[PDB]
Amino acid sequence: KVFGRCELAAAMKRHGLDNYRGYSLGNWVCAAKFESNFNTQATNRNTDGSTDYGILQINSRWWCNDGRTPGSRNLCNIPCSALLSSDITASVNCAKKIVSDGNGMNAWVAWRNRCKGTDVQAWIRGCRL
């Protein structure tokens, strides 16, 4: 599913992401925009053989099992395919573990490079939340 900006903001808010570990909603919508262009079905392969999955491009080296990433840790305890669903529940629950890991949202390279220190509130402007 390709989310609309406000539709995604609303789903993320409902799933408890607004101010999760201090990160306002706009940070989450911005990261989703540049990681996946709001497409739950986005996959991207890395040079190390791991793959990134879903709206928040969660990586198979640490977080999920895809059966093809030797020495993967599967920390979210989830097949990576579950991260491609039109229901964002699995992605959100896994992202909560990631952002709690010590590096906050810096774990998402597009967030560090394209959202961090920008006016992220702009991403939720005009939305009915």
Side-chain angles (χ1 to χ4, degrees):
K1 176 186 182 175
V2 180
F3 271 85
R5 172 176 66 88
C6 296
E7 183 185 14
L8 180 74
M12 281 176 159
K13 195 211 181 113
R14 189 193 142 218
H15 279 94
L17 279 182
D18 191 9
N19 296 116
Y20 191 84
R21 287 293 190 287
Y23 290 94
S24 65
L25 233 200
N27 283 282
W28 296 102
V29 177
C30 186
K33 169 72 188 185
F34 295 123
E35 290 287 351
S36 70
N37 206 28
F38 299 146
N39 184 357
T40 63
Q41 296 196 76
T43 58
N44 281 291
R45 182 76 149 282
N46 309 123
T47 53
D48 70 359
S50 64
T51 301
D52 294 343
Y53 292 85
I55 198 100
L56 285 164
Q57 290 290 275
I58 285 163
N59 181 264
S60 68
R61 177 55 104 286
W62 310 103
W63 302 109
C64 62
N65 181 55
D66 68 1
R68 61 161 202 207
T69 310
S72 171
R73 289 231 68 210
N74 196 9
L75 261 3
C76 295
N77 204 36
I78 207 69
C80 295
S81 62
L83 300 173
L84 301 183
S85 176
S86 60
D87 184 330
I88 64 167
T89 303
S91 276
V92 166
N93 286 169
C94 190
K96 281 179 175 174
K97 222 100 51 163
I98 298 165
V99 75
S100 299
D101 209 43
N103 307 287
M105 280 196 77
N106 295 292
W108 284 279
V109 59
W111 178 85
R112 285 205 281 112
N113 291 328
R114 307 185 69 178
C115 302
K116 193 181 188 174
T118 71
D119 171 25
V120 294
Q121 278 216 75
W123 290 98
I124 59 151
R125 185 160 170 85
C127 300
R128 182 174 261 294
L129 333 161

